[PDB]
Amino acid sequence: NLNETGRVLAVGDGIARVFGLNNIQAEELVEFSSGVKGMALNLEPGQVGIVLFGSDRLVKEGELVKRTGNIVDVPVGPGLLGRVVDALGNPIDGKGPIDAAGRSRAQVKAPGILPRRSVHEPVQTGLKAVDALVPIGRGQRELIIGDRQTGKTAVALDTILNQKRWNNGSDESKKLYCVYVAVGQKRSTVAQLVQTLEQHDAMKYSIIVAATASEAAPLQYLAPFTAASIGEWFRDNGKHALIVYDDLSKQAVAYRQLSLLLRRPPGREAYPGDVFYLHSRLLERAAKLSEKEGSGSLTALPVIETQGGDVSAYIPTNVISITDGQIFLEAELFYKGIRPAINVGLSVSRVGSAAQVKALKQVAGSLKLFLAQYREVAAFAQFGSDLDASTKQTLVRGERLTQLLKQNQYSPLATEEQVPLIYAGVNGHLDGIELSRIGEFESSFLSYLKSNHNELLTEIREKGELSKELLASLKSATESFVATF
Amino acid sequence: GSLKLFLAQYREVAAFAQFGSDLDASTKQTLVRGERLTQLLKQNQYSPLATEEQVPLIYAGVNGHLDGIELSRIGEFESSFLSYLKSNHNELLTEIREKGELSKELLASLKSATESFVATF
Amino acid sequence: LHRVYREVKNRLDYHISVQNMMRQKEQEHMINWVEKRVVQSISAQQEKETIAKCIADLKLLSKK
Amino acid sequence: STPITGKVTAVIGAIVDVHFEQSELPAILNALEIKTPQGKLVLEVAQHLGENTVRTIAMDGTEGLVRGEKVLDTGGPISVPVGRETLGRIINVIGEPIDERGPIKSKLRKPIHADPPSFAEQSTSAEILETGIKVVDLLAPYARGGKIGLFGGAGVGKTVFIQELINNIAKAHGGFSVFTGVGERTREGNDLYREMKETGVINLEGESKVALVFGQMNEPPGARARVALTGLTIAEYFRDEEGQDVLLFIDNIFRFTQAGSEVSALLGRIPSAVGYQPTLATDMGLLQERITTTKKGSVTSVQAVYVPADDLTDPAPATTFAHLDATTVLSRGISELGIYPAVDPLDSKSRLLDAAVVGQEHYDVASKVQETLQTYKSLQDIIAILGMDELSEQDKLTVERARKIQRFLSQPFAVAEVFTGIPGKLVRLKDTVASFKAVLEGKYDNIPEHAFYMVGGIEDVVAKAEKLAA
Amino acid sequence: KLALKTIDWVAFGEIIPRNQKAVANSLKSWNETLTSRLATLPEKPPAIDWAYYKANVAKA
Ligand SMILES: Nc1ncnc2c1ncn2[C@@H]1O[C@H](COP(=O)(O)OP(=O)(O)OP(=O)(O)O)[C@@H](O)[C@H]1O
Ligand SMILES: Nc1ncnc2c1ncn2[C@@H]1O[C@H](COP(=O)(O)OP(=O)(O)O)[C@@H](O)[C@H]1O
Ligand SMILES: [Mg+2]
Ligand SMILES: [Mg+2]
């Protein structure tokens, strides 16, 4: 035929150049005699360059190839929940065929300027150092940047687990479906990551798009977009979906590989000029739809791995420029004990209070202050008692306020349990307590309220605010426990 | 044996005495010896030294017989000490050369040959 | 209760996953079988060397 | 037989181009052979340039190839011997015996190239592995059937380290082992082969429990880039077909990328950032994926990674971290101090570093040790600029301890006994934790620091401190 | 539906001898654990779309 078919002229490096297909579309899929499929990214006057989704051992010279007449598409809908699929959208867990409610193109245009709303729905991560300091909002793009082995996944992972508080409820505009995008991670890791969510009953509302490192590059290229659509479904239909790209760094590497092999112009660090257009066209897909559009929303938590704190690198600079805040993590802070090691100094959020519970905002507005002055007078802590009383007071707080943020992994706390801890910290009811007993303080204090002041906690959970009556009732209950302690 | 390890301690103490603080007996003792061992290692070009001439020098160093000598003295000390053995205690040099090891007896004589020379001059 | 569910559903899903695998396989050998019968159609059929010069001379033309 | 003839048409370095006939082109990753008076120069298909021309990668010395020699198609990827037949014998990349023991009688021949196990086949474990090294068993303990990584610049202690692990696991393992030397000093192999005989692991006129695969640095870029696969294939066999525990030792794994990095330019690949080839993540990926534990058998892997210019930001090292469960980073800044093995306690992490794995007591003690060593390093700017006297009572007391624990992490290996002069010492995890615990409580604030340097068990510390006093 | 003798925790704190605080602690956490657990573990499992499976089978 020559118009719907083509002959392999040359194959290699997981990229084969075919001749023919004079009617093939851009980025369209194709199928080889062997069975392995690919998509043509380069459309030259003579030949057509096509990447492979499988080993190039299957593809030979002169082999026949036929069109598919379809662009990269993936099946979306609520059937995926509790499953584990690859970039294409096939099952890999062995639970049977998937039940999708339709398909969506890998490449979807972001919502326009008009069909959006200022983020206003908080995304409780269950992390004290986060929901208090860097609040995240439904539709926001908060970036989890940090060196290797710092606690980047911990942040997201806990977030998902902290969703059992609403997903097992009845109201929908309150739930939050989680979509994790494994890119460049070995299978062993995914199999474990999945096994953790199950032991916590989180797979009930989580979607895993696995893209192991052994898989072809393009797979690791389409993974983020594939998963992107899946979540947009929820967004379009008027719901809430949280998607975590872990990690975009690996994605760029994959894409760089394809681009170089295809002999496209190499830029800074061997990345083609369209690398930024890649992530910008991905993150902008998540947002907050207006009331007319469905009030639906898609949150994005992209993960970037820096090389020795170098946030000045190419890739990171691109991502950091697009997102709407970072949760910078440092290994050093990790070693001291501060876990999760979230550098309050750098970690920021452009949305801020706009997406934070007023119950916590009333006690967090000041918490950023003390910590701020603490980092400035942190050198004094190393000197003798010759420090004046003024500065010394700061050290007393900081040591304790920093000790409170330390939260064990897999142990998210609801807002009703955060406020009481922050309120006692800010006022300074812990200053008298030893800096060694701060840990057990949280335990015994929470258990106290849930037996004597349970009525207060439940009023904060429902109202979400703190009236002058509660502020006084909470203070009295605290001073009482601190006294008996 | 731990000579390389000792020279490591020397640079450790040498950098820490940069502060300009007084040093106790320990940190100054090793500082005294470590500074001289570095001066003993200095050797002129085109002047290869046999094994029988290296052992004796290093011996008097690692032990601490040079501690009680000025730094600008280590220079001529080497040549003088060698000429001393080649004249008097030459039998020992001949045993170290052939045997290539140190016996219980060879250490005894070598020990006394060193102390005897320190007393001289 | 959850265990009974998981296990039954698990037994059910097995049949689907299997069924699905069969289909795929078969339709591999099926569309692939196409290859070897078409490599037999051109290599053989000397009258499939005439339908060669044919469709191909309809290239030079159009392009210009 | 019906073999496919071919003819060489180009020769550039380790890259040979063969020109076959129409309809007779071999798929990618197929072996080839060329008869020579000396031996056989196996080639490996790489690309299909077109026009019936294929580009291969010379598995050996390319000198002596004549423009147009006839090549014999193997008809399939490089085949290596498998089975208990390969136990106690040295094998190169091509699967030919190189120990002068005659032919290796194997019932099967399995290709070095194969797909990674299915996500379904992946099996997670949480069992701990006891080696005998304090700094490890206490901080980052290795997992049974897990992947280990020994990072470190040049001359830090990666070889001696991995060698001790063999002297404490291999004999003590009722299963089989596979050592694979990739891009290393041929002499290190020699000493190894000698020790395996002397330890009893390999018996020439008896039974053996380990196979040996070497593709050292003396070999061309072709060899060092596939020798890792050759030994992997022999391990994998005992994994699925034999269905039993297997210890895989790779040293070094960095040569796998490097070797490929040399030829990538000649294969017409635009050099990626830092000069490495674009296909870094995938290649490094298709190797580590295969090296894993399935539901058929367990495989414990100990891969030593090289760090170019003591730089961890380098792609090669950087990429390898994600394929490891337990990472043992070695710092040169620790070597120079005399403390060995120069293991970095903060930068080195583990998967089994969980309370629900190593025990609650174990975690707490380990965490305390880490926090102590951290503050120590944090006050390094005060101990030189203001002295030790300026530090607070809580600080000085901590600092002293941090110095004792630091020196207490050092341990004499029976392998490097020729370096330290002190007899190897193997400490048990049960005693290890009990030792630091005691030191963390201040029960030995009287004992001198030099009593913790190069010492095994905690009892030896007290014994040593008493022997010095004499 | 369960009966669950209501419990004020500060009293519970105040009735344990010290040599028994250990026990009491573990008793508290188990309770909390257990509670969290039931918040997430639904009474019954999802139903089973029998029609669908009936719709895609092969053995009768
Ligand atoms: N909040 C926490 N509390 C206690 N331990 C933690 C916490 N967060 C992370 N860890 C520890 O971190 C290790 C893994 O860290 P994590 O996976 O968060 O980093 P990462 O961003 O995934 O790094 P990598 O890029 O290597 O995956 C585990 O060994 C675990 O012990
Ligand atoms: N247990 C030890 N104690 C002291 N020094 C050691 C020890 N192990 C190794 N070394 C030092 O490291 C050197 C060998 O380095 P090697 O293991 O080859 O490092 P690399 O893996 O970087 O090549 C030895 O010469 C020795 O001086
Ligand atoms: Mg991660
Ligand atoms: Mg080495």
PDB file of N, CA and C and ligand atoms in Angstrom, chain A residues 146-155 158 185 246-247 303 305 329 334 339-340 407-410, chain D residues 321-322 349-351 353-354 363, ligand 1:
ATOM      1  N   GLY A 146      13.862  17.925  46.712  1.00  0.00           N
ATOM      2  CA  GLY A 146      14.848  17.556  47.713  1.00  0.00           C
ATOM      3  C   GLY A 146      15.848  16.502  47.270  1.00  0.00           C
ATOM      4  N   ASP A 147      17.014  16.484  47.915  1.00  0.00           N
ATOM      5  CA  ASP A 147      18.061  15.505  47.618  1.00  0.00           C
ATOM      6  C   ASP A 147      17.588  14.083  47.843  1.00  0.00           C
ATOM      7  N   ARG A 148      18.426  13.122  47.482  1.00  0.00           N
ATOM      8  CA  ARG A 148      18.054  11.723  47.602  1.00  0.00           C
ATOM      9  C   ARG A 148      17.936  11.312  49.058  1.00  0.00           C
ATOM     10  N   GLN A 149      16.939  10.488  49.343  1.00  0.00           N
ATOM     11  CA  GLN A 149      16.757   9.933  50.672  1.00  0.00           C
ATOM     12  C   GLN A 149      16.571  11.040  51.706  1.00  0.00           C
ATOM     13  N   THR A 150      15.587  11.903  51.464  1.00  0.00           N
ATOM     14  CA  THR A 150      15.332  13.038  52.349  1.00  0.00           C
ATOM     15  C   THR A 150      13.959  12.981  53.008  1.00  0.00           C
ATOM     16  N   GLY A 151      13.003  12.357  52.329  1.00  0.00           N
ATOM     17  CA  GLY A 151      11.663  12.219  52.869  1.00  0.00           C
ATOM     18  C   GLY A 151      10.608  12.807  51.952  1.00  0.00           C
ATOM     19  N   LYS A 152      10.895  12.804  50.652  1.00  0.00           N
ATOM     20  CA  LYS A 152      10.026  13.417  49.655  1.00  0.00           C
ATOM     21  C   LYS A 152       8.751  12.615  49.466  1.00  0.00           C
ATOM     22  N   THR A 153       8.921  11.302  49.363  1.00  0.00           N
ATOM     23  CA  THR A 153       7.813  10.373  49.200  1.00  0.00           C
ATOM     24  C   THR A 153       6.962  10.296  50.460  1.00  0.00           C
ATOM     25  N   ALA A 154       7.628  10.357  51.611  1.00  0.00           N
ATOM     26  CA  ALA A 154       6.977  10.379  52.918  1.00  0.00           C
ATOM     27  C   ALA A 154       5.890  11.440  52.994  1.00  0.00           C
ATOM     28  N   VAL A 155       6.212  12.632  52.511  1.00  0.00           N
ATOM     29  CA  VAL A 155       5.256  13.728  52.476  1.00  0.00           C
ATOM     30  C   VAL A 155       3.999  13.327  51.723  1.00  0.00           C
ATOM     31  N   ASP A 158       2.168   9.973  53.194  1.00  0.00           N
ATOM     32  CA  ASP A 158       1.336  10.240  54.362  1.00  0.00           C
ATOM     33  C   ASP A 158       0.060  10.953  53.936  1.00  0.00           C
ATOM     34  N   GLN A 185      11.200   3.877  38.774  1.00  0.00           N
ATOM     35  CA  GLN A 185      11.426   3.107  39.990  1.00  0.00           C
ATOM     36  C   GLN A 185      11.409   1.609  39.703  1.00  0.00           C
ATOM     37  N   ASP A 246       6.154  11.228  40.835  1.00  0.00           N
ATOM     38  CA  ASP A 246       7.367  10.827  41.543  1.00  0.00           C
ATOM     39  C   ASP A 246       8.167   9.876  40.662  1.00  0.00           C
ATOM     40  N   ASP A 247       9.114  10.414  39.898  1.00  0.00           N
ATOM     41  CA  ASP A 247       9.438  11.838  39.929  1.00  0.00           C
ATOM     42  C   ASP A 247       9.641  12.410  38.529  1.00  0.00           C
ATOM     43  N   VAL A 303       7.537  15.654  42.079  1.00  0.00           N
ATOM     44  CA  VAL A 303       8.732  15.396  42.871  1.00  0.00           C
ATOM     45  C   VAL A 303       9.996  15.602  42.046  1.00  0.00           C
ATOM     46  N   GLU A 305      14.319  15.620  42.184  1.00  0.00           N
ATOM     47  CA  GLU A 305      15.508  15.221  42.921  1.00  0.00           C
ATOM     48  C   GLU A 305      16.727  16.039  42.539  1.00  0.00           C
ATOM     49  N   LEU A 329      13.456  19.737  51.081  1.00  0.00           N
ATOM     50  CA  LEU A 329      13.887  18.839  52.146  1.00  0.00           C
ATOM     51  C   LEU A 329      15.396  18.677  52.126  1.00  0.00           C
ATOM     52  N   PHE A 334      17.480  15.995  58.412  1.00  0.00           N
ATOM     53  CA  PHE A 334      17.025  14.641  58.671  1.00  0.00           C
ATOM     54  C   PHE A 334      17.876  13.971  59.745  1.00  0.00           C
ATOM     55  N   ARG A 339      12.233  15.024  61.642  1.00  0.00           N
ATOM     56  CA  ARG A 339      11.597  14.237  60.589  1.00  0.00           C
ATOM     57  C   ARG A 339      10.088  14.450  60.595  1.00  0.00           C
ATOM     58  N   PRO A 340       9.515  14.842  59.445  1.00  0.00           N
ATOM     59  CA  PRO A 340      10.165  15.040  58.145  1.00  0.00           C
ATOM     60  C   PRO A 340      10.995  16.306  58.138  1.00  0.00           C
ATOM     61  N   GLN A 407       7.320  14.412  63.439  1.00  0.00           N
ATOM     62  CA  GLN A 407       6.194  13.500  63.396  1.00  0.00           C
ATOM     63  C   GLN A 407       6.621  12.182  62.771  1.00  0.00           C
ATOM     64  N   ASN A 408       6.313  11.080  63.448  1.00  0.00           N
ATOM     65  CA  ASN A 408       6.676   9.764  62.942  1.00  0.00           C
ATOM     66  C   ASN A 408       5.968   9.466  61.643  1.00  0.00           C
ATOM     67  N   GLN A 409       6.561   8.584  60.850  1.00  0.00           N
ATOM     68  CA  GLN A 409       6.009   8.252  59.547  1.00  0.00           C
ATOM     69  C   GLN A 409       4.786   7.354  59.671  1.00  0.00           C
ATOM     70  N   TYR A 410       3.875   7.483  58.712  1.00  0.00           N
ATOM     71  CA  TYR A 410       2.684   6.657  58.681  1.00  0.00           C
ATOM     72  C   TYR A 410       1.784   6.987  59.854  1.00  0.00           C
TER      73      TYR A 410
ATOM     74  N   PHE D 321      21.321   4.495  42.981  1.00  0.00           N
ATOM     75  CA  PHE D 321      20.727   4.506  44.316  1.00  0.00           C
ATOM     76  C   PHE D 321      19.310   3.923  44.327  1.00  0.00           C
ATOM     77  N   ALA D 322      18.510   4.296  43.330  1.00  0.00           N
ATOM     78  CA  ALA D 322      17.116   3.855  43.226  1.00  0.00           C
ATOM     79  C   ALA D 322      16.942   2.343  43.030  1.00  0.00           C
ATOM     80  N   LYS D 349      22.052   4.654  54.500  1.00  0.00           N
ATOM     81  CA  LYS D 349      20.738   4.302  55.002  1.00  0.00           C
ATOM     82  C   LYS D 349      20.425   2.852  54.682  1.00  0.00           C
ATOM     83  N   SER D 350      19.272   2.387  55.152  1.00  0.00           N
ATOM     84  CA  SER D 350      18.814   1.027  54.882  1.00  0.00           C
ATOM     85  C   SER D 350      17.294   0.934  54.868  1.00  0.00           C
ATOM     86  N   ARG D 351      16.797  -0.167  54.321  1.00  0.00           N
ATOM     87  CA  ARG D 351      15.369  -0.440  54.234  1.00  0.00           C
ATOM     88  C   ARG D 351      14.884  -1.039  55.543  1.00  0.00           C
ATOM     89  N   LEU D 353      15.782  -0.329  58.307  1.00  0.00           N
ATOM     90  CA  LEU D 353      15.998   0.618  59.399  1.00  0.00           C
ATOM     91  C   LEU D 353      14.669   1.041  60.003  1.00  0.00           C
ATOM     92  N   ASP D 354      13.866   0.055  60.375  1.00  0.00           N
ATOM     93  CA  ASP D 354      12.540   0.316  60.909  1.00  0.00           C
ATOM     94  C   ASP D 354      12.364  -0.393  62.239  1.00  0.00           C
ATOM     95  N   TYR D 363      16.191   0.366  67.075  1.00  0.00           N
ATOM     96  CA  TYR D 363      15.984   1.615  66.349  1.00  0.00           C
ATOM     97  C   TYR D 363      16.419   2.808  67.181  1.00  0.00           C
TER      98      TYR D 363
HETATM   99  N1  LIG F   1       8.515  11.095  58.669  1.00  0.00           N
HETATM  100  C1  LIG F   1       9.431  10.107  58.820  1.00  0.00           C
HETATM  101  N2  LIG F   1       9.687   9.520  60.008  1.00  0.00           N
HETATM  102  C2  LIG F   1      10.604   8.538  60.124  1.00  0.00           C
HETATM  103  N3  LIG F   1      11.331   8.060  59.096  1.00  0.00           N
HETATM  104  C3  LIG F   1      11.173   8.565  57.846  1.00  0.00           C
HETATM  105  C4  LIG F   1      10.189   9.638  57.646  1.00  0.00           C
HETATM  106  N4  LIG F   1      10.211   9.967  56.348  1.00  0.00           N
HETATM  107  C5  LIG F   1      11.132   9.173  55.755  1.00  0.00           C
HETATM  108  N5  LIG F   1      11.694   8.323  56.640  1.00  0.00           N
HETATM  109  C6  LIG F   1      12.773   7.362  56.281  1.00  0.00           C
HETATM  110  O1  LIG F   1      13.202   7.705  54.969  1.00  0.00           O
HETATM  111  C7  LIG F   1      13.614   6.550  54.252  1.00  0.00           C
HETATM  112  C8  LIG F   1      13.065   6.724  52.844  1.00  0.00           C
HETATM  113  O2  LIG F   1      12.890   8.134  52.653  1.00  0.00           O
HETATM  114  P1  LIG F   1      12.000   8.711  51.441  1.00  0.00           P
HETATM  115  O3  LIG F   1      11.559   7.538  50.606  1.00  0.00           O
HETATM  116  O4  LIG F   1      10.947   9.635  52.006  1.00  0.00           O
HETATM  117  O5  LIG F   1      12.969   9.638  50.553  1.00  0.00           O
HETATM  118  P2  LIG F   1      12.755   9.717  48.960  1.00  0.00           P
HETATM  119  O6  LIG F   1      12.356  11.131  48.607  1.00  0.00           O
HETATM  120  O7  LIG F   1      11.841   8.590  48.544  1.00  0.00           O
HETATM  121  O8  LIG F   1      14.255   9.424  48.445  1.00  0.00           O
HETATM  122  P3  LIG F   1      14.512   8.535  47.128  1.00  0.00           P
HETATM  123  O9  LIG F   1      14.557   9.558  46.019  1.00  0.00           O
HETATM  124  O10 LIG F   1      15.813   7.809  47.379  1.00  0.00           O
HETATM  125  O11 LIG F   1      13.319   7.615  47.091  1.00  0.00           O
HETATM  126  C9  LIG F   1      13.098   5.337  55.012  1.00  0.00           C
HETATM  127  O12 LIG F   1      14.203   4.499  55.374  1.00  0.00           O
HETATM  128  C10 LIG F   1      12.435   5.878  56.268  1.00  0.00           C
HETATM  129  O13 LIG F   1      13.034   5.274  57.418  1.00  0.00           O
END
